[PDB]
A paper describes a structure:
Additional X-ray crystal structures of rTub occupied with varying amounts of W revealed that tungstate accesses the internal type-2 binding sites through tunnels that are closed after binding. With seven tungstate bound, all six type-2 binding sites are occupied and one type-1 site. Based on the occupancy and B-factor statistics, a binding model of tungstate to Tub is proposed. Tungstate simultaneously binds to type-1 and type-2 sites indicating random binding, except for the final binding site located within the trimer center.
Here, we characterized E. limosum Tub, a tungsten storage protein. Tub has a sub-nanomolar affinity for tungstate and contains a single TOBE domain first characterized in a molybdate storage protein. Crystal structures revealed Tub assembles as a hexamer composed of a trimer of dimers, capable of binding eight tungstate oxyanions at two distinct binding sites located at inter-subunit interfaces. Tub enables E. limosum to accumulate W and then supplies W for two tungstoenzymes needed for conversion of lactate to SCFAs.
Residue numbers in the entry:
A (entry chain F), C (entry chain B), E (entry chain C): 1 to 69
B (entry chain E): 1 to 71
D (entry chain A): 1 to 72
F (entry chain D): 1 to 70
């Protein structure tokens, strides 16, 4: 599928913390930036995610806030 | 303030597209990646955002999905 | 791509309301159900969406609440 | 109450996956479509949700993305 | 309807700023706190919201972050 | 940090329900109102949140729906 979401950031999975219904996937997207994703364990298994998997952090623009110092 | 949001990615404003109640801020976060953020115009003003401003893309972990090519 | 989101509902576009930076896409997903999606105008154009286009409503499970009468 | 959410889809609960703080409710909304909802276990209890209960999947329009096929 | 959303905060509308597809409703919920809600203009009209309307701010728990000084 | 999020509500932690990857922080914001927050356990530890901590409920405006009595 092709998605409307303005943010689709390629990266490699560096860790997966598993829970009973959800897990937290950490993605290295390069340049020293990491994105953490809290998603269902069902989706983590269905996508075959492992440490080292290539993937994308997918974020709708309306979910992104801006901060300043 | 210190925020629980797992994703707080430093970057520079590349563009601001203004609307009536919301606008879209594009952040260059390095490594060739940019993040687009849809936020209220009042917040864009209150935060003093301009092209070239230093800022952060702030994202709650429960807002991030994962995709794969699945070739 | 293949997306983690638990909800990926095929449907046909029945209306598009254009705004300044966002628009509202309405999808007929069958069974008398329609879904409205508020997304950026850039994504509406980049995806080539028109009335009658085939598309999908994509929703993360953590975005869905449950109600009862 | 009456809710602003543009998406309020009637359906029947077909499964509930219970966890420690959250659970996943799957709603059959007809036409071959199902909606999965991740919500707190306390909410599942307070609403008395069971397999077979009537309910609604409630989704804010700003939470819905659109996809198209890869070959479009 | 009765909603799963853990946050349902009673208040009065103190401001409505209208846009083309969305608007922003500000609700005074007491104690000096106001909650701003960005929702579709259709919902604003359909709920009959005006300055002075009684309403509720409804927020899913997974949408709420915590901050500290 | 200064956040664009239009909703930033001061309160005191009255409870934390811990899970394996997320927890639920209940914040008393006064006037009889509470805010519940489902966030990662890493964040709860990273902010040192405990019962009695002063904190803020932070909500993006696009995350808030409005309801009315019918």
């Amino acid at each position: 599928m092709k998605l409307s979401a303005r943010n689709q950031l390629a990266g490699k999975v560096v860790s997966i913390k598993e829970g009973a219904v959800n897990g937290i996937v950490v993605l290295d997207i390069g340049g020293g930036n990491q994105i953490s994703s809290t998603i269902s364990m069902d989706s983590i298994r269905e996508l075959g995610l492992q440490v080292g998997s290539d993937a994308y952090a997918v974020i709708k623009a309306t979910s992104v806030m801006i901060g300043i110092d």
